[PDB]
Amino acid sequence: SWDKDVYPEPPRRTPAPSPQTSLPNPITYLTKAFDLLVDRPVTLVREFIERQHAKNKYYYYHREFRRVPDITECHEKDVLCMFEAEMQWKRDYKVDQEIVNIIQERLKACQQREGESHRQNCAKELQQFTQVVKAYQDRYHDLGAHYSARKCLAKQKQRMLAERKATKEAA
Amino acid sequence: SHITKDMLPGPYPKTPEERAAAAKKYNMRVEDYEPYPDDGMGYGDYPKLPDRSQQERDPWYDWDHPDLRLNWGEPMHWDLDMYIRNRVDTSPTPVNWNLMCKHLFGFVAFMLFMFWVGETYPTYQPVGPKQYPYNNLYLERGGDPNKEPEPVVHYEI
Amino acid sequence: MNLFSSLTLVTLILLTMPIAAINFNTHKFTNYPLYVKTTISCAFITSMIPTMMFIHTGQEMIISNWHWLTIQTLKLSLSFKMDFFSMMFVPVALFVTWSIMEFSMWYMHSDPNINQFFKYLLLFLITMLILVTANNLFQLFIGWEGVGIMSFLLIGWWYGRTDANTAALQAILYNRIGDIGFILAMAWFLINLNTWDLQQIFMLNPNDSNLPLMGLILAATGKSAQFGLHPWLPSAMEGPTPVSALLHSSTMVVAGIFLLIRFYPLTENNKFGQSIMLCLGAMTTLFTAMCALTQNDIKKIIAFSTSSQLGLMMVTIGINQPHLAFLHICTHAFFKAMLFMCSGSIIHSLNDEQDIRKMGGLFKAMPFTTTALIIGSLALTGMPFLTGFYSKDLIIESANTSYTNAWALLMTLVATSFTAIYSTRIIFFALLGQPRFPTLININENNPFLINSIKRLLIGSLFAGFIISNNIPPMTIPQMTMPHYLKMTALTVTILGFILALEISNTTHYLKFNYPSNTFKFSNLLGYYPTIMHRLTPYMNLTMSQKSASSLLDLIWLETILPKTISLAQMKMSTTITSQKGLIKLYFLSFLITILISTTLLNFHE
Amino acid sequence: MLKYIIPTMMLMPLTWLSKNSMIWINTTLHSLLISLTSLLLLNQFGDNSLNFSLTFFSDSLSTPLLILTMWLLPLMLMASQHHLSKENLARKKLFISMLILLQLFLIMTFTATELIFFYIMFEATLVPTLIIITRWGNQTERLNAGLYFLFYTLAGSLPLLVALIYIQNTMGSLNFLILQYWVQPMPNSWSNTFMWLACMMAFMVKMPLYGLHLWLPKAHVEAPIAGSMVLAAILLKLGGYGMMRITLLLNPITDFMAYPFIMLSLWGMIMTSSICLRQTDLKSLIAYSSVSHMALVIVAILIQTPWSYMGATALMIAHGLTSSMLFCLANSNYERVHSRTMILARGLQTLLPLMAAWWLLASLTNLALPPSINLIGELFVVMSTFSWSNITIILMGLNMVITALYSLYMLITTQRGKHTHHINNILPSFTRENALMSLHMLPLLLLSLNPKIILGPLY
Amino acid sequence: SFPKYEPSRLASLPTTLDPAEYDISSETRKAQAERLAIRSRLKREYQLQYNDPSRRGVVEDPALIRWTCARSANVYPNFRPNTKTSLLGALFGIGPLIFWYYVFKTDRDRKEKLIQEGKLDRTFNISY
Amino acid sequence: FGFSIVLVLGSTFVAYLPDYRMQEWARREAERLVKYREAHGLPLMESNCFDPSKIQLPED
Amino acid sequence: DAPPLTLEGIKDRVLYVLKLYDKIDPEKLSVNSHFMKDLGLDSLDQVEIIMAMEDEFGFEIPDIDAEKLMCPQEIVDYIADKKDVYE
Amino acid sequence: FLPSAAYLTHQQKVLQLYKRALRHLESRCVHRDKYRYFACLLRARFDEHKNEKDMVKATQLLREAEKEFWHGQHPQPYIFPESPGGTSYERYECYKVPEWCLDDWHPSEKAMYPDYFAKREQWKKLRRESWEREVKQLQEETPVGGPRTEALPPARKQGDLPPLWWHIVTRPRERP
User: Fold this and answer.
1) What parts of the sequence cross the membrane (chain C)?
2) Residue range(s) defining the domain that contains residue G74
3) Is H150's Cβ below 8 Å from some Cβ in E?
4) Residue H111 carries which DSSP code?
5) Domain of G45: which CATH number?
């Protein structure tokens, strides 16, 4: 299962076909025969395998880590601060990429479920996608291959100094 | 094994002994042995052949090598890897070569020019644009939920 | 629906047993053709159901699972999508290939290599299915290169025959130019939309799109025998008959225009793009129609005809009408599968001689095949109104009711006239002439598999166009309001083509021994394009391979710059240092001049 | 890691104190046991490398290459009989122990920590290959082959030592983390240009780049099969591994100074794919194919994208397997006829009707058939270089077309159309060569299913 | 009645309209007789060393060996650096290299200056 | 000892093993973090990953 | 596509198409007859006969042979060599 | 380019022209009746000056005939589907296996087909039994120090097989 809060679904909508025919309805006959001749033994086998696995219990824990402080609280060369700082930053980098993956999966689900009216009821999700990708483009993009943490902080300082000069000139 | 003097150093000169040795070596007619000549492009002293030779050699001779027209002892023209049938077929053409290229270039040039004459001059059956119901079908294009209404209407005609 | 996804995935998985079966068997099954035929029939009967469910309600759904290398901000799973094209094309292709399984049971009765043949043909079907279903575009590229290389193997089935593997080399080369176009399209989609997946491409419509559109154009004109890159098509007809039938009936021939159909939201706008579409298609259609006249090999004629119909579909994509082009795919598929199968029936009936000269009169040599070919070749141009009517004539009238390019309309005009005249000429020269074919006749069609296959495809090509064209969801607004002398013009052009080929026939009855007037030669001799390109482009690259590349630049100059300078320098310096004869006065004079030249000239003590 | 080092030592006196018809089972069995032993390695996770000592460690670039080496040894050892089984027993033992010492210095080289140790084990990787190819070079110019070989690799790799000692005594020690965690940018003075030029040019020699690719073809046409597989797969991808490590330093000037090498690599990739379309000596076509793939590798290394490095390491591993396999098939054909030429041995669709299946499978992997790893590598490198420039895709696609054509010409030239019917000595296919093909093309397809292992550090 | 069939480097000249086959001197008869004699002796040697029932190996043609040794190993000897060789070497070896080099300098300077302006479409350009 | 103990055992050993480069750990961690940042109103993926209070721009 | 040929059948078919030819007689039409001595026809119509065999049976014969058939028995022998006529 | 002599002759050159023009007239002309008319017309056109005692005017008319032929040929001359260039060109070469094979089989299948392999073994003993003496003596016996021909004499001496016959007899059957 999953968290439906973080994976939202639109409310379900289903009509009922009303013939207004007299052939009648071969596919209903076929889907009833399909359910009776396919869905029953797989259900019984799944019941069997569920008992055989629920006879004893395992667990896998979600791994959780602490928060070692920052690169900004590390000294000149002094590796024993920088090591914790950069592995903390790199784990934030991987989880941030997977956040972007989750937003894009939401965007694909909104494209498929909303149908051929594209620009209806995806515009808020498109809005938050452009917001988060503006953040990602501004923050992690143009550093290249050998990012460690230091080029990220250099980009940070250079960006906010450029914006400070821009608002100083605009004022 | 293989004789050391069945290799091939140096070009044609001088004419008696070297051409006699190449006639004894490459198994050719004496005054049909042709080096390239020596412009220093490498090439050794290997013969020049009539250079097409493979849509030639009409296939009812019943030689040895059935898909190469070999006869086990021909001096084997330098560019043979470009001349196996399935690579380059130099048939005597049914028309020409110049006539071919001139008519092909003329036809393709004329058709592309008529395409340009089409591109500047469209057809249309005489009909105005469609009467989209809600402001050129607004709110269902790219977005804009409450930014700007774009008022444009249609009148019954 | 669980039924919908379940039946589609088992239509996939039914084409997985026999390959692994005879890879695991080692005991040679006698009933292997029967087995492959009945599993294709079971795939057909499982594929008929969810398409009927699709037209019954809709419920238009994608499947996506088993993600591998979900590396960066993208991901890619094996995923394919049931919308309309990948939804209800698959029964047509399975039906066509099932009839070809019948016809290849019979036609390949006399080879022990039949099992590998059916393995290759079923593998080609699997890859064509994985091509036409996917929305994850990497899987599309998988299906692309797989159907290319299965086309290579099935053209080069008969080893020996240097013309055959020459031809297969041409086919795989134009497949790779399709590959460079497709990977340029994939490059632009990745670097400007963070994925290569159909759904997000449709979600965000970019403004500047000329580079991926040119990539898609290059992919289509490489894949589907279009002008500039067309002449691999008689090349593709070099191979065996059911290979050729499946190769250019539905599978591997529509895959070039299948992509441009699939990207219809991207090719909505960019009128420059649609102009490129329909101008290129008009060029293909006129050139292959003009080349199709004065040809005497049957398979080259049927291949030029299918290139002309594909050019009509390129024009159909040039106008914003993709769904009529898909209608044309289905009708065309039934149509020329039945036509190739009738042709191969005639050819193997008459000792594999295949040429129209030395075939002349074969009407009433049993008229099942003559009836079959006149059904097919009058379904060409659409005798009003049959399955062939709908696609071709609604396409040309909708093109006439469109903001067209004013020259492509005349190209479709002349192309419809040309396809009429070679259709009527091939019927006359094939069937109702005077019988010119060598003696000891061995004509036989009292044959259950052949009458089943030809029966099944005439029953298909008589009804399926109307049945499919009736129950489409209306995906466009039909025009239906034409002026006078613009709806009549279809039947006008086809009737004048019939009359024109009739009068050419009744001049062929005469005796004059006329002369070539070089338009005869331009029509007959492929005009000049395969000869010029296939004799100039191999010679140029291999002239540059021998002189410049191999013998000149790398070997002799790179060996005379990096080794030889060093080796000559070391050799000359050795032979001037250590080549000193053994006297003592030399050594002490060298000592003295060294002491003086170290003390006072280049000083060491100051 | 010493758990892998010391049985590779103890596989050497095994070969000495085994006797006739007794060395073989011992060497092959125990080398396959070491293959399982390093299949146990793959633990590497998340944050960093894994340190197998104060001296050894493994990046995730190094794990698939190390597993590839210990996979490739027993395959190679079975491959190198029937052309020396009739030679002497002591010379055969010397050959096997030479290969074992060779693998030992390869493991030494891949599991390096310090770049000086890496350099010592680099030329210790060099010295057994020399002795193998010169002692069993089997043709009249093995002299010139070994001479060109050793002088190119040393005289290119000679100033690399000087540059690394200079980096050693200007920036502290040379652990890869302390090469990292402390590296500062170095501006565009010309001494920086020569230092970058020295390191990158030594590994350019070892890839090869295009201006120094005639190092290669003599050293493969006049080599035995074991030294050829060693040389091609492990030495060229070892050079790529070395540049992939040492490109961490000197990033602020590689943009300004990397322009000629990219263009040399691109135009030489086109020229090399052109030059292997028309040559005879079928063994050499795989060598120029290797130059083409390594030119694509060098494009991928000098552009510095994580996309580029993932595509680079996938292209490394897939091309290593493809080239080693295809060398083994060319050795099979040379065992059939004593020619080495291309146009002579023809036919063979009739005869040996399943050798052609392996030729087809190798030719389609060299085509980069799309589920395989080679297309994964080439595709991500093309993606990264198109983000590098909007123009270079002409060269990549034209490489793809000419690569398709020469690989297909290799397929349908020697094994399509007509046997020359004056051969009449070729045997039906042994179980041994079929076993070698099966050892090649099971792991390539099994990685084609699940390729998340072989991608690089920037996964 | 016909423009007499101008030849080319691709269109072969067929055996009919040579028109040198119709000026038959005695030298052409002598050359054809000697050429038939050469082909006769070569086919005799080949067929006698081709039909031997004890002959196991291949017939080992010296023609193919001689052509291969002339093609690969007999290039570097012999050579002299001529004006034509040096000219064509520096043209077909250095010309395209320096041309592609300058055009990639131009494209890279365009893209660097344009993204230094910042007005490029890299709103999301992640896969660099 | 080349297929019957190497190939299928290596296939099982590399078909699954723990999370190579922390993949599904990152999946579920991103799930929980985006659920937290939706359930507490603050915008998901805050830009400026280092704290601007703990930064010092050099001056002109 | 394999009808079995036989020696009597190929003899009958070749003699049928020789008898159908105009300027010979059905009386003096022997199996062992010359195209030069007793039938008296010229080389031109002899190669017309060679063309009739090529156009009936479906394969060329080379001009190294068309000099030197000159009798129907060697015609039957030569198509027996091209076809290898036994079951 | 032919095995018998160093040239064809004038006669056979004119003859090959007649065969080619007649074949191209087939490829030009359908319905076979007007074909027969035009073939007799072409026969009369060659009958006009057949009896020239001159030779140089005959070969000049041959060259002008080649000009009017090459101007008037067909784009697809009607090549039969057994000829090279044609539709077949060794069409069933898939099964044209040479017979130096079939002895490299496992003796299980040699037990499957016993009589054929016994008779094949006595064929090979027939081959080796008369290989050295008669064949090599008849090759190094008759001709001049240069052979200067591509024919070869038969074994008319007393007994056994004509020389150099193995790859002539043991060929594929051209429809397997």
Assistant:
1) 4-24, 43-63, 84-104, 114-134, 140-160, 171-191, 213-233, 241-261, 272-292, 301-320, 325-347, 366-386, 413-433, 457-477, 485-505, 582-602
2) 9-83
3) yes
4) H
5) 1.10.1200.10
